[PDB]
Amino acid sequence: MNSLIKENMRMMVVMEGSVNGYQFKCTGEGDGNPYMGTQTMRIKVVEGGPLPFAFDILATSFSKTFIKHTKGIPDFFKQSFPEGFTWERVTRYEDGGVFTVMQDTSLEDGCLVYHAKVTGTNFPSNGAVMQKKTKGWEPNTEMLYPADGGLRGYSQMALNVDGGGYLSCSFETTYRSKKTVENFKMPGFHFVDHRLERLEESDKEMFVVQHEHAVAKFCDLPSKLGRL
Amino acid sequence: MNSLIKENMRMMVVMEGSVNGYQFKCTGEGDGNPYMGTQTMRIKVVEGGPLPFAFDILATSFSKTFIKHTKGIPDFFKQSFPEGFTWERVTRYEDGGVFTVMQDTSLEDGCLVYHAKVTGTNFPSNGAVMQKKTKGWEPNTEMLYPADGGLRGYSQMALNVDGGGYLSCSFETTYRSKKTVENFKMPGFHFVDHRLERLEESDKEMFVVQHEHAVAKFCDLPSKLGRL
Numbered sequence: 001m002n003s004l005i006k007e008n009m010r011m012m013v014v015m016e017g018s019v020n021g022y023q024f025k026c027t028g029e030g031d032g033n034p035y036m037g038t039q040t041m042r043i044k045v046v047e048g049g050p051l052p053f054a055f056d057i058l059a060t061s062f063s064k065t066f067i068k069h070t071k072g073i074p075d076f077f078k079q080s081f082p083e084g085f086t087w088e089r090v091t092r093y094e095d096g097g098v099f100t101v102m103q104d105t106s107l108e109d110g111c112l113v114y115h116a117k118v119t120g121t122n123f124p125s126n127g128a129v130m131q132k133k134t135k136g137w138e139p140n141t142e143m144l145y146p147a148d149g150g151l152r153g154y155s156q157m158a159l160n161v162d163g164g165g166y167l168s169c170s171f172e173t174t175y176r177s178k179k180t181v182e183n184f185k186m187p188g189f190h191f192v193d194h195r196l197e198r199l200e201e202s203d204k205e206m207f208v209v210q211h212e213h214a215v216a217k218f219c220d221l222p223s224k225l226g227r228l
Numbered sequence: 229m230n231s232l233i234k235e236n237m238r239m240m241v242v243m244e245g246s247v248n249g250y251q252f253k254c255t256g257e258g259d260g261n262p263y264m265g266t267q268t269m270r271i272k273v274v275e276g277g278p279l280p281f282a283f284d285i286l287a288t289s290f291s292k293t294f295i296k297h298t299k300g301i302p303d304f305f306k307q308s309f310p311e312g313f314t315w316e317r318v319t320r321y322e323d324g325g326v327f328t329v330m331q332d333t334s335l336e337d338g339c340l341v342y343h344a345k346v347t348g349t350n351f352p353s354n355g356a357v358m359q360k361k362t363k364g365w366e367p368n369t370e371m372l373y374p375a376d377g378g379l380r381g382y383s384q385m386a387l388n389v390d391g392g393g394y395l396s397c398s399f400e401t402t403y404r405s406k407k408t409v410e411n412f413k414m415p416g417f418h419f420v421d422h423r424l425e426r427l428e429e430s431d432k433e434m435f436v437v438q439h440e441h442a443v444a445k446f447c448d449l450p451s452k453l454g455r456l
Contacts, residue, residue, distance in 0.1 A: 139447035
């Protein structure tokens with residue numbers, strides 16, 4: 001309902017960085033329905049492939065404009081255009097892996113443009129990520145509230161691994177709008193349900209197709225205090 | 229649908245421990261509708277009151293039998309009777325407070341009986357908890373999966389504070405059944421939505437009434453992979 005965010009939008013991304021020292025670069029292009037909360041991206045590893053670590057640890061770093069907003073929840077991301085927004089995140093893994101990201105989101109000639117700078121370290125050589133024994137993420141519920149002149153999110157995610165168990169992680173995200181705070185409506189406390197899925201891959205994950213469904217919502221449960 | 233867990237059940241609790249060294253003891257009694265996911269408890273501070281820290285940090289330690297289970301999710305807790313279950317948890321606060329709990333849940337003469345041993349430390353003297361500037365929890369979504377011969381949960385919660393912002397925390401819980409694993413159905417990966425609310429208080433929180441609504445569920449979002 002921002003005139004610049006159409007019911008169908010394209011996006012492209014460049015990701016550069018390293019994991020455990022292993023330098024790489026990826027590019028991607030995709031499209032989605034921003035108001036329906038759906039999107040698809042086709043990603044290529046263009047430098048350093050095939051990568052010696054699980055592509056799953058990169059998956060959350062490739063698109064916040066495509067969240068369906070329900071109930072009365074203002075859309076931090078769609079309201080930000082044309083100025084756009086940034087996000088920064090630190091993910092911590094249960095077996096010691098760490099992944100840090102700085103992301104810029106812009107709009108140019110009608111297409112969303114993403115740059116992600118990423119740094120991963122301390123993934124154990126014996127672990128599912130460096131042995132490529134990982135098998136995709138579960139859905140998850142992000143918890144958000146305004147903080148520090150931006151929007152803070154907190155996430156906890158479970159990564160399936162070979163044999164049938166899970167590797168957990170958590171992250172904190174700080175989302176920042178390039179539009180001045182006086183010129184958009186800030187949301188309050190809310191949730192975003194996510195379901196990040198891999199649809200296709202080839203060539204030892206040198207090509208990956210990912211999809212996300214995402215919906216901003218309140219907790220569905222009734223309240224004894226008349227609270228959202 | 230365990231014959232020992234009736235549609236209305238009573239419970240009683242004893243909590244003993246300390247926070248920042250401050251010893252205390254609480255007792256409580258309540259009742260609820262286990263299959264509806266609702267419960268109410270009336271709690272008294274019987275030693276050490278009035279407490280010099282926010283009662284809100286004790287709130288999650290006072291009842292897992294009262295979760296409404298949807299879809300196909302076996303109920304770890306209701307299946308455990310008559311043997312019962314335990315839980316252990318470590319909560320970590322964003323301003324450094326830490327709270328550790330060991331809990332036993334039994335059934336005696338038709339009433340649920342809880343014992344919670346709690347230890348809290350490193351709450352800052354300047355913080356909302358020790359200045360009693362806290363104003364109740366937001367709802368939250370716990371993420372669970374079987375692990376270590378038990379059920380693991382991961383939670384992240386936001387505590388309202390005076391002035392309008394939040395103090396965040398996270399915790400990991402290990403739930404263990406006293407019934408042998410061969411004799412009940414273990415759930416898979418799932419979520420529990422919670423809404424823990426304070427309804428009444430008196431006497432500088434020497435008396436507190438709390439309510440919880442809790443529902444076990446899958447993520448509501450559609451999947452491109454035919455997954456729950």
